Symmetry: C2
Subunit: 167 residues, 2 copies
């Protein structure tokens, strides 16, 4: 028993009872251990959830990283389709994702490909946030049935500018 073991059990438990059934009490019970041993590793419920959300994203890493020279545009579509499938495959995957803060190296790597393909740093960043937040919203709704303002505005302009193109 260590952090990985706890997180793997927690994910099993999420698969079995959905996000609302996930608690430090039920998880300790499951591990055949009492609560303090579990509170060694995660001090709050939100530490646990964060670790689970970070661990639940591992399958997105089944996507090959971009290759130098390849179409940034086709890549960006694949990469976002992968992001959506990851969240969508996991029970309450989007709520798990949205209920915590977040392969940071893997993100920088993908950002460098984008910058090399001629998307300026600021736009690469905004485009990747926009796409992810849109995906979070999309899947959350599917599964039910820091300058945030300037990030919102940049994402919104992307959408609307995409639309202007069909008018």
């Amino acid at each position: 028993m260590n952090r990985e073991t706890v997180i793997t059990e927690a994910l099993d438990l999420l698969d079995e009872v959905g996000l609302d059934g996930v608690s430090t009490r039920r998880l300790a019970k499951r591990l055949g251990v009492e609560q303090p041993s579990l509170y060694w590793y995660f001090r709050t419920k939100r530490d646990l959830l964060t670790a689970m959300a970070q661990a639940a994203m591992a399958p997105h890493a089944a996507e090959p990283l971009p290759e130098p020279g390849e179409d940034w545009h086709g890549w960006f579509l694949r990469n976002t389709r992968s992001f959506r499938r990851t969240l969508l495959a996991r029970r309450d995957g989007a709520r798990l994702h949205a209920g915590s803060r977040p392969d940071l190296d893997r993100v920088r790597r993908k950002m460098d490909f984008l910058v090399a393909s001629g998307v300026p740093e600021r736009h690469a960043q905004m485009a990747m946030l926009a796409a992810g937040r849109f995906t979070v919203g999309c899947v959350l709704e599917e599964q039910a049935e820091i300058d945030h303002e300037s990030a919102f505005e940049a994402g919104l302009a992307l959408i609307t500018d995409g639309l202007v193109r069909h008018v």
Copy 2:
């Protein structure tokens, strides 16, 4: 004086105060200075209380003027999404409340907004997708700020919109 709108308004104020994770019938009862079972008659369950709170939370968005023929559809589009954002941010954990108990949209208002976009020359299918994209994007944005037609098709179209808007900033040099 006990009154449904009153209870709901008091619940949304409670939400502002304690966070969504702190909203309970017992806590609302106490804010109101009443016996907790007296609230059962308004909201049989916590689920029903939330649904009601989520619906009332949208009123400020519904209070906005509808678009009129002749106005710039482009500026209105931005303005509409800015309104939706502002609405969600107006109550603490506003976007979790929304996402958790999806309110029912005014079909009359949704149709008038859509008609305006179509009469402005936006092709219908694209207007619909844009409108879905814009909303879903705003939920995801606001969720992250505050934390601090089939779904497949809609996802694909909203993603192409985003990626298309990016093309203009691209310069391979």
